[PDB]
């Protein structure tokens, strides 16, 4: 197993910025791809981004040019800078972990951390 413990979200308003963080611990194979994604009310769950461990990234297409992926790997640690934050990036974030276990595919979730943006909290 992969834990996953994340960190970082709370209430922001419209343009502002957040960082969230996920911690991993646990059997981390050499080979795996760690994942933010987000679940708001009236919406399926959400890829935001994505890294492999040499960094390559993708993003979703909603949050290109405002969200940014990283690490701290003396942490073991995977971070999501949230920049121009809108009203519907509203959600509950979560880090996720991919990676092979001896009888297939394993996605690993951390618990969440909410994220909400708004103007008239």
């Known amino acids: 197993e992969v834990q996953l413990l994340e960190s970082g979200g709370g209430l922001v308003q419209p343009g502002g910025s957040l960082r969230l963080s996920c911690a991993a611990s646990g059997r981390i194979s050499s080979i795996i791809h760690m994942a933010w994604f987000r679940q708001a009310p009236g919406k399926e769950r959400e890829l935001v981004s994505e890294?492999?461990?040499?960094?390559?990234?993708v993003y979703a297409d909603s949050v290109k040019g405002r969200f940014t992926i990283s690490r701290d790997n003396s942490k073991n640690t995977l971070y999501l800078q949230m920049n121009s934050l809108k009203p519907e990036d509203t959600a509950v974030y979560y880090c996720?972990?991919?990676?092979?276990?001896?009888?297939?595919?394993?996605?690993?979730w951390g618990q969440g951390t909410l994220v909400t943006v708004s103007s008239h909290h």
């Open positions: 996720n972990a991919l990676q092979y276990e001896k009888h297939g595919g394993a996605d690993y």
């Open positions: 890294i492999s461990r040499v960094g390559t990234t």
